[PDB]
Design a protein around this ligand. Structure first.
Ligand SMILES: O[C@H]1CC[C@H](Nc2nccc(-n3ncc4ccccc43)n2)CC1
Lengths: 321, 9
């Protein structure tokens, strides 16, 4: 009676009366998302109905992780929570979790291929990095940034859609089975940037092995010191490819491609480094002359197991409440 | 430098 129902395909959305004009815009394994107008905040929102949160402990933990990290994490460059709710009135009746977020206009897939000027390119990248830096401060390393999970509005603002864990934006650490650290995210930012400057996917591997070869064909075969860090099985393969020299970044990104171009190149040459121990950090990328132009300390320096289904249910119910 | 305030979708 605070709630009403709309049918979205085979699924029923029961939502607060403030949320009108529901139109489905997403449907994965994680859940159905509708766009919607919020009549109280007088703006557009995205409403996500969680796919079977208590079906099992895999779903239960992921839903818990989503709920808590969205509550606590708070930054203009990260999709934040506007609201959460359930239409059910008691722990016993509890079934469905609705998360409400700001509605963004687009993802980066189609935008990045339209040649942006430096100002916009650098500003978008400055934004991503402030978002990543904030995620990293909360102990969240994403591992899976790509055009599809970075969202923008027509006012050139930008947010990171989700909290992570198309293999084209995966770091070599992830592609092989090596450990990773914070700067695993720098790689994904490196691919995205290169793409902006070039106009198409940097490393379009047709499979989890061709991804490697695409990378080395352009960047050169990594050091034998890097090879020693690999698992035996992957090292026997990788170590026995033909040796690639790679091209210098001047060749990989010549003045010809750009709308400053020298600065963007130096940065790229520091992000797309295969060996992560030699790859630039988030903080060093924020201080880079190509990115530093926008620096604002309020943006680039802000502040930060075992259960059964019935326990998870409660834990989630309380978080809704 | 002025922060861009438009983006073409
Ligand atoms: O192509 C664009 C992409 C961005 C859309 N806006 C938007 N805004 C907030 C969350 C959200 N989510 N959140 C989860 C999700 C899943 C699928 C699609 C959108 C999703 N989508 C508008 C259409």
């Amino acid at each position: 009676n605070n709630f009403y129902s709309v049918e979205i395909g085979d699924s029923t959305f029961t939502v607060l009366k403030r949320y009108q004009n529901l139109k489905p815009i997403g449907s994965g394994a994680q859940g159905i998302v509708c766009a919607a107008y919020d009549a109280i905040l007088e703006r557009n929102v995205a409403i996500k109905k969680l796919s079977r949160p208590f079906q099992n402990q895999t779903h239960a933990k992921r839903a818990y992780r989503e709920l808590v990290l969205m509550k606590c994490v708070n930054h203009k460059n990260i999709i934040g929570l506007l609201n959460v709710f359930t239409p059910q009135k008691s722990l016993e009746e509890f079934q469905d979790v609705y998360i409400v977020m700001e509605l963004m206009d687009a993802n980066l897939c189609q935008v990045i291929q339209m040649e942006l000027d430096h100002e916009r390119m650098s500003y978008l990248l400055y934004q991503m990095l402030c978002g990543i830096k904030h995620l990293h401060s909360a102990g969240i390393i994403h591992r899976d940034l790509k055009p599809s999970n970075i969202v923008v509005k027509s006012d050139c603002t930008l947010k990171i859609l989700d909290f992570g864990l198309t293999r084209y934006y995966r770091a070599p650490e992830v592609i092989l089975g090596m450990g990773y650290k914070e700067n695993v995210d720098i790689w994904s930012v490196g691919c995205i940037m290169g793409e902006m400057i070039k106009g198409g996917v940097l490393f379009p591997g047709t499979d989890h092995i061709d991804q490697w070869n695409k990378v080395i064909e352009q960047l050169g075969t990594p050091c034998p010191e890097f090879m020693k860090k690999l698992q035996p099985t992957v090292r026997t393969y990788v170590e026995n490819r033909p040796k690639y020299a790679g091209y210098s970044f001047e060749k990989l990104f010549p003045d010809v491609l750009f709308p400053k171009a020298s600065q963007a190149r130096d940065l790229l040459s520091k992000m797309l480094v295969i060996d992560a121990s030699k790859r630039i950090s988030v903080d060093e990328a924020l201080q880079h002359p190509y990115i530093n132009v926008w620096y604002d300390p309020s943006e680039a320096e802000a502040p930060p197991r075992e259960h059964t289904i019935e326990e998870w249910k409660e834990l989630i119910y309380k978080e809704v409440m | 430098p002025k922060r861009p305030t438009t983006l073409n979708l």
